[PDB]
Amino acid sequence: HHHAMDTYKLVIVLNGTTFTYTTEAVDAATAEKVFKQYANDNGVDGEWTYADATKTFTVTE
Fold first, then answer.
1. Which residues on adjacent β-strands are paired with residue 24?
2. From the CB of residue 45, how many other CB atoms can be counted at a distance below 10 Å?
3. Cβ–Cβ contacts within 10 Å for residue 32, how many?
4. Which DSSP string corresponds to 14-61?
5. How many domains does the chain have?
6. How many CA within 13 A on the CB side of residue 39?
7. CA distance 56 to 8
8. What does the alpha-carbon distance between residue 28 and residue 17 come to, in Å, rounded to a whole number?
9. Edge-to-edge strands of the sheet including 18-25?
10. Beta strands 18-25 and 47-51: pairing type?
11. Which CB contacts under 8 angstroms, 24+ apart, belong to 41-45?
12. In terms of residue numbers, what domain contains 18?
């Protein structure tokens, strides 16, 4: 199923514990749509930052 994608990664830093979730997406606007859906579905409200060099979204709280 069409392989023209990057791997994107979500990092959620809590109290000394870190959860990450990494997934393929067509672009960063798309991976942010998936991740923000996942976050909300799990009890995660927080401050987000994206780093294009590593295709990583980082959420703290």
1. 7
2. 8
3. 16
4. -SS-EEEEEEEESSHHHHHHHHHHHHHTTT---EEEEEGGGTEEEEE-
5. 1
6. 24
7. 6
8. 25
9. 18-25, 6-13, 56-60, 47-51
10. unpaired
11. 44/12
12. 1-61
User: For residues 56 and 11, is the Cβ–Cβ distance under 8 A?
Assistant: yes
- What CATH number does the domain containing 40 carry? 3.10.20.10
In angstroms, the CA 9 to CA 23 distance is 6
Q: Give the determination technique.
A: X-ray
Task: Please provide the size of the chain in residues.
Answer: 61
Question: What are the residues facing 11 on neighbouring strands?
Answer: 20, 58
Tokens of 27: 């672009």
Supply 26's token pair: 């067509």
